[PDB]
Design a protein around this motif. Structure first.
Motif, short mmCIF file in Angstrom:
data_model
loop_
_atom_site.label_atom_id
_atom_site.label_comp_id
_atom_site.label_asym_id
_atom_site.label_seq_id
_atom_site.Cartn_x
_atom_site.Cartn_y
_atom_site.Cartn_z
N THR A 103 0.94 -1.48 -0.13
CA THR A 103 0.02 0.10 -0.03
C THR A 103 0.74 1.27 0.14
O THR A 103 1.71 1.18 0.63
CB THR A 103 -1.03 0.08 1.29
N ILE A 104 0.51 2.25 -0.71
CA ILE A 104 1.28 3.62 -0.72
C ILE A 104 0.02 4.64 -0.15
O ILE A 104 -1.09 4.89 -0.83
CB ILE A 104 1.44 3.89 -2.41
N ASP A 105 0.53 5.38 1.01
CA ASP A 105 -0.09 6.28 1.35
C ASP A 105 -0.04 7.65 0.75
O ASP A 105 0.90 7.84 -0.24
CB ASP A 105 0.00 6.66 2.93
CG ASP A 105 1.43 6.76 3.19
OD1 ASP A 105 2.27 5.90 3.45
OD2 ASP A 105 1.91 8.26 2.99
N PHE A 106 -0.57 8.62 1.21
CA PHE A 106 -0.71 9.95 0.45
C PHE A 106 0.73 10.81 0.59
O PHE A 106 1.21 11.36 -0.21
CB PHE A 106 -1.91 11.20 0.89
CG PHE A 106 -2.17 12.01 -0.22
CD1 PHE A 106 -2.83 13.21 0.47
CD2 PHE A 106 -1.48 12.04 -1.28
CE1 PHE A 106 -3.11 14.23 -0.39
CE2 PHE A 106 -1.93 13.03 -2.28
CZ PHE A 106 -2.54 14.29 -1.72
N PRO A 107 1.20 10.86 2.06
CA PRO A 107 2.60 11.36 2.14
C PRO A 107 3.71 10.83 1.11
O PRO A 107 4.39 11.55 0.49
CB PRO A 107 2.90 11.19 3.70
CG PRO A 107 1.72 11.03 4.27
CD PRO A 107 0.60 10.73 3.21
N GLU A 108 3.67 9.46 0.90
CA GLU A 108 4.46 8.88 -0.19
C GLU A 108 3.95 9.44 -1.66
O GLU A 108 4.89 9.78 -2.31
CB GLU A 108 4.28 7.49 0.01
CG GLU A 108 4.78 6.72 1.16
CD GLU A 108 4.36 5.32 1.34
OE1 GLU A 108 4.51 4.56 2.38
OE2 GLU A 108 3.73 4.78 0.43
N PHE A 109 2.68 9.50 -1.82
CA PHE A 109 2.42 9.74 -3.21
C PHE A 109 2.54 11.34 -3.40
O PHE A 109 3.26 11.70 -4.67
CB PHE A 109 0.67 9.65 -3.44
CG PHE A 109 0.54 9.67 -4.74
CD1 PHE A 109 -0.17 11.11 -5.13
CD2 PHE A 109 0.55 9.23 -5.95
CE1 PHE A 109 -0.61 11.34 -6.40
CE2 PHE A 109 0.27 9.33 -7.17
CZ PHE A 109 -0.43 10.70 -7.38
N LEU A 110 2.40 12.24 -2.49
CA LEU A 110 2.66 13.70 -2.89
C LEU A 110 4.34 13.83 -2.96
O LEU A 110 4.56 15.06 -3.84
CB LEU A 110 2.42 14.44 -1.58
N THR A 111 5.00 12.77 -2.76
CA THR A 111 6.37 12.82 -2.85
C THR A 111 6.88 12.60 -4.39
O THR A 111 7.58 13.15 -4.97
CB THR A 111 7.41 11.93 -1.92
N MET A 112 6.17 11.59 -4.87
CA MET A 112 6.46 10.92 -6.20
C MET A 112 5.92 11.86 -7.15
O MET A 112 6.34 11.94 -8.24
CB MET A 112 5.73 9.71 -6.38
CG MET A 112 5.83 8.67 -5.11
SD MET A 112 4.47 7.54 -5.27
CE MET A 112 5.21 5.96 -5.05
N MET A 113 5.17 12.73 -6.75
CA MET A 113 4.58 13.77 -7.59
C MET A 113 5.84 15.00 -7.93
O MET A 113 6.05 15.57 -9.03
CB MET A 113 3.33 14.60 -7.58
N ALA A 114 6.03 15.31 -6.64
CA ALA A 114 7.11 16.45 -6.76
C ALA A 114 8.38 16.11 -7.20
O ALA A 114 9.54 16.77 -7.83
CB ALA A 114 7.33 16.98 -5.24
N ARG A 115 8.84 14.78 -7.09
CA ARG A 115 9.98 14.11 -7.32
C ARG A 115 10.19 14.29 -9.03
O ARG A 115 9.24 14.53 -9.76
CB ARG A 115 10.35 12.67 -6.95
#
Lengths: 359, 113, 57
Positions: free
Chosen positions: B31-43
Motif C-alpha cells: 500500500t502507498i499512502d498520500f505522504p508517499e504519493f505527494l513525494t512521487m509527484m514532486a520528485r
C-alpha cells in the motif's frame, strides 16, 4: 630447478605484484614478470589478466587500451584471440568481451579496446562481415553500441534526452559507405541492450563498493562516504567483531563499545552498527597500516586484549586504539590477518622508497 | 495545489488514505499512502547541474577557473581524468589563452545538442 | 606514500566545501566531459571510413 614453493613470503610478493598492477599496471606486470609469476610474453600476460583473480578490471582496461606501447598492444591482441565470438551477434560478442574488461573511461582507450574487439569479431564471423560494403562498419557499430549502453543507463543523460529506438537507427544512417546497416540488425541490438545493460564482471573493487554502501546507508548533491574506500588496489581482507577499550587499566561492562571492524589490505576501518533488521554501519575511524604494530594483552579486566600502536620512522610511538576480542580464536585470526597486511604494506612502501631513490 | 489529492482519492476506495501499487501507475497517468504519493509527484537538466558543478570550484564567484586549478581537481578527484584529457578540456575551455577557463561557455560547448 | 595521497585528496575536497559536495561536482564535470569526448570521437570515426581498420597488421 623446480617450481617455487608458495610459502608466506612468496604469496606476499605475489599480492604485492597485484597491488602494484592495480595502482600502475605497467609496473605491476614488470614486477610479476621479473619474479616468475607470469611469463615474459604478450600471451602469458594476456592469459594472466583474463584468468587471475585480484586484478581490477578497470585497470586491466587502462592497460590494454594503451595505444602507444607495443607490449600493451600485443597483449590486447592476444586477449581478444583467446575469445571466440563465432556465430554471436555483435552486441552479444561485445558483452562477452566487456564482461572481462571494463570498457569505460578515456575515449582513446575505449576506441583502442573496441578496435581490437572488432578486428577479432570480423575474424570470427567472415559471413557477417561480407554482408557489409565496408568491414569498418562493424567497428563503428560496436562503438555505437558502447555509446548506446551508456546513453540508455547513465543518469547524466536525462530520459527525455535519451536515444529512443529510432534515434539510435537514424544516428547510424548511411554509415556503410553511404548505405544503412540493415534496419532489423539495429532493432535487435537496441532491444537486447534495452533488456540487459552491458555489465562488467565483478572484482575485488565491486566487493569493497558493497561495503561502502553498507556504511553509508541509503542516500543527492553529496552521495557516498567521506572516507574513500573503493580504490582499485584496495581489497577486503576480513571482518571482525571487537569491543573498543578506552582504558585497558579499568573495567567496563560486557558488550559496551561494540565495533564491527573491516580490515582491507592497506586500511583498518572501525564502525559501529547503526541499524539491524540487513545490517548498516556508522563509520567511526580508519587507520593506515604503515608503521602500525599489533600487541596482545591480558590483565585482570580483559582476557583477549589487542592494542594497536603507531611507530612511524622519524616519529614518536603512539597508541592508536585498544580492543578486547570475544574469544581467543577471534583475536588470533584477526591479529594474524592484521600483522600479515602490515607486513605487506611495509614491503610496498619499502619497494616505493627504492623506486624513488633510483629514479 | 491539491488537484493530485482528488485523483488519489478516486483510487482510495475505502477512504483510508491509501492507493494500491497496482494502480500506482494508473494514478500518475491521470500500500502507498498520500505522504508517499505527494513525494512521487514532486520528485533539473544537465546544463544546470554542470554549471553548478563548475561553480563549486569557482570559490570567488568570478565566472572563471584557473587552468592549473581545474587540472589539479580533474586529475585528482572523482573519476580521475588523464592529463591528455585535461589538455583537450583546456584547449576548448580557455577561450582567451591566458590560462583562465571560461566554464560557462564550455558548459554549452559540451551540452551543444 | 599512500597515506599522504589520501590526506591530499581529503584536503583538496575540503578546500571547496563539504567533501561529498566537491567530489560529486568533479564527477559531474568528468562524466559530461567523457561522454562529450565519446560523441566527438564517434563523429570523427564515421567521417573517415577509408582506413581499413579491421585488417590487423
Amino acid at each position: 630447478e623446480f617450481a617455487f614453493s608458495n610459502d608466506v613470503i612468496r604469496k606476499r610478493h605475489y599480492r604485492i605484484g597485484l597491488n602494484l598492477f592495480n595502482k600502475k599496471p605497467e609496473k605491476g606486470v614488470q614486477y610479476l614478470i621479473e619474479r616468475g609469476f607470469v611469463p615474459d610474453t604478450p600471451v602469458g600476460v594476456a592469459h594472466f589478466l583474463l584468468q587471475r583473480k585480484g586484478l581490477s578490471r578497470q585497470m586491466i582496461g587502462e592497460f590494454l587500451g594503451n595505444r602507444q606501447k607495443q607490449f600493451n598492444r600485443d597483449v590486447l591482441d592476444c586477449v581478444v584471440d583467446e575469445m571466440d565470438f563465432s556465430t554471436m551477434e555483435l552486441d552479444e560478442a561485445l558483452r562477452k568481451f566487456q564482461a572481462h574488461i571494463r570498457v569505460q573511461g578515456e575515449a582513446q582507450k575505449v576506441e583502442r579496446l573496441i578496435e581490437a574487439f572488432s578486428q577479432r569479431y570480423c575474424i570470427c564471423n567472415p559471413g557477417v562481415v561480407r554482408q557489409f560494403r565496408n568491414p569498418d562498419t562493424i567497428f563503428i557499430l560496436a562503438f555505437a553500441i558502447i555509446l548506446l549502453n551508456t546513453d540508455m543507463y547513465s543518469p547524466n543523460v536525462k530520459p527525455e534526452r535519451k536515444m529512443k529506438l529510432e534515434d539510435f537507427i537514424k544516428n547510424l544512417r548511411g554509415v556503410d559507405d553511404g548505405e544503412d546497416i540493415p534496419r532489423e540488425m539495429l532493432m535487435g541490438i537496441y532491444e537486447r541492450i534495452r533488456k540487459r545493460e552491458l555489465k562488467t564482471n565483478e572484482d575485488h573493487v565491486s566487493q569493497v563498493q558493497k561495503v561502502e554502501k553498507l556504511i553509508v546507508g541509503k542516500k543527492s548533491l553529496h552521495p557516498g562516504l567521506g572516507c574513500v574506500l573503493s580504490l582499485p588496489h584496495r581489497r577486503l581482507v576480513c571482518y571482525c567483531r571487537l569491543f573498543e577499550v578506552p582504558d585497558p587499566n579499568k573495567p567496563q561492562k560486557l558488550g559496551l563499545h561494540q565495533r564491527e571492524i573491516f580490515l582491507f589490505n592497506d586500511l583498518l576501518v572501525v564502525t559501529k552498527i547503526f541499524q539491524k533488521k540487513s545490517v548498516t554501519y556508522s563509520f567511526r575511524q580508519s587507520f593506515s597500516l604503515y608503521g602500525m604494530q599489533v600487541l596482545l594483552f591480558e590483565n585482570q579486566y580483559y582476557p583477549n586484549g589487542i592494542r594497536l600502536t603507531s611507530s612511524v620512522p622519524g616519529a614518536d610511538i603512539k597508541v592508536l586504539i585498544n580492543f578486547n576480542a570475544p574469544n581467543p580464536q577471534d583475536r588470533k585470526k584477526f591479529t594474524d590477518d592484521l600483522r600479515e597486511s602490515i607486513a605487506e604494506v611495509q614491503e610496498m612502501e619499502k619497494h616505493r622508497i627504492e623506486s624513488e631513490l633510483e629514479k | 495545489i491539491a488537484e493530485f489529492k482528488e485523483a488519489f482519492s478516486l483510487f482510495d476506495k475505502d477512504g483510508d488514505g491509501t492507493i494500491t501499487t497496482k494502480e500506482l501507475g494508473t494514478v500518475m497517468r491521470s500500500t502507498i499512502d498520500f505522504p508517499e504519493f505527494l513525494t512521487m509527484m514532486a520528485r533539473t537538466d544537465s546544463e544546470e547541474e554542470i554549471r553548478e558543478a563548475f561553480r563549486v570550484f569557482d570559490k570567488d564567484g568570478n565566472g572563471y577557473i584557473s587552468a592549473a586549478e581545474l587540472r589539479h581537481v580533474m586529475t585528482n578527484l572523482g573519476e580521475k581524468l588523464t592529463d591528455e584529457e585535461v589538455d583537450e578540456m583546456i584547449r576548448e575551455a580557455d577561450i582567451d589563452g591566458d590560462g583562465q577557463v571560461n566554464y560557462e561557455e564550455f558548459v554549452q560547448m559540451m551540452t551543444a545538442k | 606514500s599512500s597515506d599522504l595521497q589520501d590526506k591530499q585528496v581529503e584536503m583538496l575536497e575540503r578546500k571547496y566545501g563539504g567533501r561529498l559536495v566537491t567530489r560529486h561536482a568533479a564527477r559531474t564535470i568528468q562524466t559530461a566531459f567523457r561522454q562529450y569526448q565519446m560523441n566527438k570521437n564517434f563523429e570523427r570515426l564515421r567521417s573517415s571510413m577509408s582506413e581499413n581498420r579491421m585488417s590487423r597488421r
